[PDB]
């Protein structure tokens, strides 16, 4: 009942004072807090309220109670920070166990309250009710923990680790090893808490930061500054790099994978390399704004909106139409477009991924996140030392785990592994592209045979069961491996690895993959394109080839390419270079001209080539106009030789045996 | 070379040149279309001069500007009381004295929309006084109904003013008092004229309906009339 609920809330509130309090003799305005008794029992019973009740009833009500009484912010942080600062001063000089006991048990609650949140069709209605609100409260937690004394609780958590670093692994009991798992398990949460995702019941078709929270409190930029001052990055670096020497790998190296995922996520590598500067580029951007303004002006009438006359347009067969406005009098292109634009209907439309936190897989990544200069250089230093120090030893362990455990996996661990591989391999390639001090040997553990098998196997199994999110990530990982191979061939075993990578079975898979992309989201198709470009380019420099290229060329691939190309207002300068490379391959080299004589391509080239779309001076117009010229020349030749193609141009090609051969050629 | 945008034109020159003898009549009978044609002719000619004579002037600057013709000396002046319903939408010429001018009124020309959920934006063209609001948000992944909304202070506006013109005593009927007519004037010509000024004008003689109440589309049978000036002298 409501009264039983508030009785438990009141029980918690009383426990929220039995804990202790600051001293009003002190005349120190204010002092720190001061300590209660039964407090062991207080902490333990709170732990029981989580584990023995809320978990067993699947509620999150208990968390709502502790959030009501602000336990984290009010007691746990000063209890820990006082323990830390006391022991720090004692170390400067250079029952006490009971104090240390309290330090352990306060931290374990911090891990529990900030643990990240999952919702399914098997979660209770209680949890589904409370999801949106507890998100707000966890955001408050992240801000607070990073703020206190400029984040000094984070020194307490690592000092706890330092006690268990201390003495030889040969001594270290299972209970002892849990501390070293626990500490790293904390930092994962502090990075993982981020602004909410809005969710509603789909009964009818019709921000969540609380008043005390703002973006600069919560941004990844902040977290960098906070960890650096409070001495975390040294701990993650030392701990990962000596990992091979007999720290029991089993307890550390998955939590330590999740950290690296959880703050590589949302960085584009180009933002870490530069390739008054801000003001200069701002001025240039204002020039671009002026061009857009000019485009609007070129469609704007001189005289006002009620001056306008009326226009009539007569067709062949003497039938007439009517359009209004003063620009229609002079511009037939505009009149024709304006005529169709009035018409009401649009055909309604069809729509791939859920269950996991925001990442490259389901967001448009043409949108950076933003760094102070000190933060930029500190972050660059952290991951550069990580790569030069830790990467091979980490990947070798985590991969030779997962080969023995693949059957037992869960979707998240698959998507973590495939987006840790991808990031670090790409970033190193870019860094050594830039400079000679860097080298490729640092990432060279990715190529050895076991990992290649494992990325292959993940992609295989994901594709067969029609799990499209793992398939998407696996596509991204398998792209980079191929990219790295072409690098190393441009310098023995690598050719053996290629020959095994391009057994016939895999060519069947990698040929299959663009065909299904037509239905799905804009990123999926983009992954398919970039993988295809790489896949063909390697086999070009193998010297088989004619068998493989004919395997790619057919109607359902071309359909995907156009369906992707028409959203060009959103895409990069580089991706369109890739698409026209492929059309050059289909049209000129392979001489399979009949695929592209289809009408929705001819519309597209007008839009994109018009004064509407692609800029008059972008590099894209060089490629596009050089393509269309050749297109229309060959089309002219075909149409005059055989006039039936006028009715051909609307429809798909015709698959009958007796007429179809002459049709295609 | 003076950086200016309007060209005077006395209509008698259209009668002197043989190829435009009929264009003179078409101007009086169809002003709204013919004047627009003349505007887009002048702008193109200005561009042609700099590109043909290959001069140093910025093509973008000329493309950005609006150019307008202002015809005048069209024919005999017409008595204010003798305008009849067969003169609607034809060019007229009037003489008179200025009584008063209202302050400048902002007139909207372009509307600005923003999506409430995904922050997509669209600029829309105003014609015939009606805002062509979109049915759904046009961003592909945010194809939602009622999702766009108007932002007043990011629209674009233009100046309108109303001038009250009185009949000159030379035309008043015997034993009667002079009448007056209202002139609508835009952009360049807005603040030109003061109380007590004596002028001659040229503009289309227009008429429009008026509503019975502000709640509903019900119109009255009598129509309001006014003059839409394109030149003042």
């Amino acid at each position: 009942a409501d009264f039983s609920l508030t009785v438990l809330r009141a029980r918690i509130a009383l426990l929220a004072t039995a804990i202790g309090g600051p001293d009003y003799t002190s005349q120190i305005d204010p002092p720190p807090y001061k300590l209660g008794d039964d407090c062991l029992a207080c902490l333990k019973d709170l732990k029981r309220w989580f584990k023995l009740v809320d978990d067993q009833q699947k509620r999150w009500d208990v968390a709502m109670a502790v959030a009501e009484y602000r336990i984290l912010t009010d007691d746990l942080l000063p209890i820990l920070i006082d323990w830390e600062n006391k022991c720090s001063l004692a170390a400067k000089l250079a029952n006490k166990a009971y104090y240390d006991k309290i330090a352990l048990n306060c931290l374990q609650l911090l891990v529990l309250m900030t643990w990240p949140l999952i919702v399914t069709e098997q979660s209770s209605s209680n949890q589904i009710t409370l999801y949106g609100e507890l998100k707000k409260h966890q955001l408050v937690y992240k801000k607070t923990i990073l703020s206190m004394e400029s984040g000094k609780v984070l020194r307490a958590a690592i000092r706890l680790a330092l006690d268990v670093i201390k003495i030889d692994r040969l001594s270290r009991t299972p209970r002892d090893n849990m501390v070293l798992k626990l500490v790293l398990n904390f930092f994962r949460n502090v990075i993982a808490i981020e602004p909410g995702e809005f969710t509603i019941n789909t009964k009818k078709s019709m921000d969540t930061l609380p008043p005390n929270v703002s973006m600069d409190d919560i941004s990844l930029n902040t977290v960098i500054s906070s960890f650096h001052k409070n001495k975390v990055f040294g701990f993650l670096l030392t701990l990962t790099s000596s990992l091979s020497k007999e720290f029991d790998q089993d307890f550390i190296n998955i939590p330590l994978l999740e950290i690296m995922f959880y703050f590589t996520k949302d960085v584009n590598q180009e933002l870490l390399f530069p390739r008054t500067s801000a003001g200069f580029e701002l001025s240039k951007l204002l020039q671009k704004e002026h061009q857009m303004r000019k485009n609007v002006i070129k469609h704007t009438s001189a005289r006002h909106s009620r001056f306008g006359g009326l226009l009539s347009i007569q067709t062949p067969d003497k039938t007439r139409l009517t359009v209004s406005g003063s620009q229609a009098l002079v511009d037939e292109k505009i009149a024709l477009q304006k005529l169709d634009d009035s018409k009401k209907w649009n055909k309604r439309i069809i729509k791939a991924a859920e269950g996991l936190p925001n990442s490259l897989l389901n967001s448009q990544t043409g949108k950076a996140i933003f760094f102070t200069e000190s933060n930029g250089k500190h972050f660059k230093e952290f991951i550069n030392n990580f790569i030069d120090s830790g990467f091979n030893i980490l990947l070798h362990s985590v991969t030779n785990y997962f080969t023995t455990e693949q059957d037992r996996m869960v979707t998240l661990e698959q998507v973590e592994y495939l987006l840790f591989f991808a990031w670090f391999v790409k970033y190193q390639l870019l860094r050594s592209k830039i400079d000679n001090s860097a080298d490729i040997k640092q990432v060279s553990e990715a190529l050895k045979e076991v990992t290649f098998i494992l990325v292959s196997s993940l992609l295989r199994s994901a594709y067969d069961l029609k799990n499209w999110t793992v398939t998407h990530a696996g596509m991204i990982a398998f792209n980079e491996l191929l990219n790295l191979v072409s690098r190393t061939k441009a310098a023995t075993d690598i050719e053996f690895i290629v020959s095994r990578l391009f057994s016939d079975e895999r060519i069947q898979l990698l040929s299959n993959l663009p065909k299904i992309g037509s239905k799905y989201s804009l990123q999926f198709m983009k992954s398919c394109i970039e993988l295809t470009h790489s896949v063909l380019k390697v086999l070009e420099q193998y010297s088989n080839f004619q068998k493989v290229q004919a395997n790619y060329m057919t109607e359902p691939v071309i359909e995907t390419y156009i369906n992707f190309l028409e959203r060009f207002r959103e895409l990069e300068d580089d991706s369109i270079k890739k698409v026209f490379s492929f059309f050059h391959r289909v049209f000129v080299q392979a001489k399979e001209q009949a695929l592209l004589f289809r009408f929705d391509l001819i519309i597209l080239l007008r839009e994109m080539l018009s004064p509407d779309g692609l800029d008059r001076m972008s590099r894209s117009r060089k490629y596009v106009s050089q393509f269309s010229d050749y297109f229309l020349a060959r089309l002219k030749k075909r149409l005059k030789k055989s006039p039936a193609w006028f009715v051909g141009l609307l429809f798909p090609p015709l698959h009958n045996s007796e007429v179809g051969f002459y049709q295609r050629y | 070379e003076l950086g200016t945008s309007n060209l005077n034109l006395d209509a008698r020159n259209l009668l002197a040149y043989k190829q435009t003898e009929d264009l003179y009549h078409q101007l009086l009978n169809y002003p709204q279309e013919v004047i627009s044609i003349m505007d887009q002719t002048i702008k193109d000619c200005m561009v042609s001069l700099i590109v043909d004579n290959n001069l140093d002037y910025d093509l973008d600057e000329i493309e950005t500007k609006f150019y307008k013709v202002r015809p005048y000396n069209v024919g005999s002046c017409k008595g204010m009381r003798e305008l009849n319903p067969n003169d609607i939408d034809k060019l007229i010429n009037l003489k008179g004295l200025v009584l008063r001018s209202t302050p400048v009124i902002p007139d909207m020309k372009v509307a600005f929309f923003k999506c409430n959920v995904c922050d997509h934006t669209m600029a829309v063209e105003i014609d015939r006084g009606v805002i062509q609001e979109p049915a759904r948000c046009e961003r592909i992944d945010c194809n939602e109904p009622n999702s766009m909304s108007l932002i007043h202070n990011r629209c674009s506006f233009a100046d309108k003013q109303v001038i009250k013109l009185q009949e000159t005593p030379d035309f008043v009927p015997d034993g009667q008092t002079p009448h007056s007519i209202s002139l609508c004037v835009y952009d360049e010509l807005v603040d030109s004229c003061r109380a007590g000024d004596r002028i001659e004008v040229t503009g289309t003689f227009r008429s429009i309906p008026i509503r019975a109440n502000s709640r509903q589309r019900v119109l009255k049978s009598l129509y309001k009339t006014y003059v839409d000036v394109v030149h003042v002298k």
Partner: peptide, 11 residues
């Protein structure tokens, strides 16, 4: 219940 996230929300 037909719970659903605003997966498309990215501004």
């Amino acid at each position: 219940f037909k719970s659903r996230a605003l997966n498309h929300v990215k501004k």
